[PDB]
Amino acid sequence: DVSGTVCLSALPPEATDTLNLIASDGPFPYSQDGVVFQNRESVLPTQSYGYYHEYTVITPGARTRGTRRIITGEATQEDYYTGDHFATFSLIDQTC
């Protein structure tokens, strides 16, 4: 399940950078950005394979990709943030 909706302005500023890169089709900082997200644990709504894609949200200071990601869905404005490496998700509201 999705935990609720969160305004983009309440998320780390790096999430706004990742959404702007998705809008321009990159270029992205990591080679893993844009891969399909399988939703293997069924935390998000069930959809066909390829409906969801994963993008990194950079964690300042980290050596690795860290635990923050945006998952896009194919629907308009459907983007989910996770800050705990896919354990929980919130829908992003880009209007606020």
From Swiss-Prot:
Transmembrane segments: none annotated. Keywords: Disulfide bond, Endonuclease, Hydrolase, Lyase, Nuclease, Secreted. It is found in: Secreted. GO terms for molecular function: lyase activity; ribonuclease T1 activity; RNA binding; RNA endonuclease activity. Changing residue 39 to A/D/S: Decreases protein stability. Gene3D superfamilies: Microbial ribonucleases. It catalyses: [RNA] containing guanosine + H2O = an [RNA fragment]-3'-guanosine-3'-phosphate + a 5'-hydroxy-ribonucleotide-3'-[RNA fragment]. The active site is at residues 54, 85. Its EC number is 4.6.1.24. GO terms for cellular component: extracellular region. Disulfide bonds join 7-96. It holds the Pfam family Ribonuclease. CDD domains: RNase_Sa. InterPro entries: N1-like, Ribonuclease/ribotoxin. Belongs to the ribonuclease N1/T1 family. This is Guanyl-specific ribonuclease Sa. The gene is rnaSA.
